Design a binder for this molecule. Structure first.
Ligand code: CL
Ligand code: CL
Ligand code: CL
Ligand code: CL
Ligand code: NA
Length: 128
């Protein structure tokens, strides 16, 4: 479970600040509402897929969890890699997702809770 500023710093080190034009506060806001900053978060979807990790990346498209029929593994990783204390796999897969044409609208919590808001508040006070 990251602190806000700790996660901001880790995301910046791993290349998310202004990635595909999304400022760091967007990514921190998305992680807050997707996972509560918890790398171990998992949530099953209605359709049988599961969302994994700090950015709740979905097994329907992005990772293999062994139990999501007809799904793809576009990030080429086990979904468990998205639960690690090390956010590298989540960041690298999120870079692919955000590049795929719909930007951060892929993250429902971002669209509904971060988009259009003062996202820079999420990085206030942080040494990065
Ligand atoms: Cl802290
Ligand atoms: Cl920001
Ligand atoms: Cl939402
Ligand atoms: Cl500190
Ligand atoms: Na999959």
């Amino acid at each position: 479970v990251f602190g806000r500023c700790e996660l901001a710093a880790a995301m910046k080190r791993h290349g998310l600040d202004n990635y595909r034009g999304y400022s760091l506060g967007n990514w921190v806001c998305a992680a807050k509402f997707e996972s509560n900053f918890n790398t171990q978060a998992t949530n099953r979807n209605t359709d049988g897929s599961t969302d994994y990790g700090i950015l709740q990346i979905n097994s329907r498209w992005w990772c293999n969890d062994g139990r999501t029929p007809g799904s793809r593994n576009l990030c080429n990783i086990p979904c468990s890699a998205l639960l690690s204390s090390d956010i590298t796999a989540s960041v690298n897969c999120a870079k692919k997702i955000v590049s795929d044409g719909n930007g951060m609208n892929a993250w429902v919590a971002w669209r509904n809770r971060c988009k259009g808001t003062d996202v820079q508040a999420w990085i206030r006070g942080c040494r990065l």
